[PDB]
Design a protein around this ligand. Structure first.
Ligand SMILES: COc1cc(C(=O)[O-])ccc1O
Length: 164
């Protein structure tokens, strides 16, 4: 499917916000979303669709403990690019429960990036953000809420990104 997404799922946690210079953290603990942030850096952001669709509990083992137990979840894997080069790998797990009312948009993203700057129709909350890493790269997972309805976001920062 994609080597970056394979790395992403290998991320390992122990939270601990990386003592590394507080300029790497401001990225890793960033609360506004990646896209606009990547754009500020002066570059066209674009989405590469790897796989989107409903999956059962046994296809989301790393996320399951952080979400409620439902019949299926909407899984979306994408790669995010800056002026053509991959800067990040993204994997979203959305309990079917969350896809109620205006949240059915989470299913119609296409090659359009996820949340906020159009999600000025809803109102998000953020339970947390914990840093992870593996094979030398940074990654973070966060549980977001739209009207209280949870979804899990995990990202991996790739070598070409404005972190390392
Ligand atoms: C998981 O994080 C990301 C996901 C997506 C997406 O699915 O379109 C876009 C940007 C991200 O930072």
């Amino acid at each position: 499917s994609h080597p970056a997404l394979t790395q992403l799922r290998a991320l390992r946690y122990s939270k601990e916000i990386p003592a590394l210079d507080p300029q790497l953290l401001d990225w890793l603990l960033l609360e506004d979303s990646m896209t606009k942030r990547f754009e500020q850096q002066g570059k066209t952001v674009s989405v590469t669709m790897i796989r989107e669709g409903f999956v059962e509990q046994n296809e989301i083992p790393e996320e399951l403990p952080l979400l409620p137990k439902e019949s299926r979840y909407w899984l979306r894997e994408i790669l995010l690019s800056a002026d053509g080069e991959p800067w990040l790998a993204g994997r979203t797990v959305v309990p079917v429960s969350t896809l109620s009312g205006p949240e059915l948009a989470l299913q119609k993203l296409g090659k359009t990036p996820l949340g906020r700057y159009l999600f000025t129709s809803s109102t998000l909350t953020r339970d947390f953000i914990e840093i992870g890493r593996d094979a030398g790269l940074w990654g973070r997972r966060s549980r977001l809420r739209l009207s209280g309805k949870p979804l899990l976001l995990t990202e991996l920062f790739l070598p070409a990104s404005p972190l390392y």
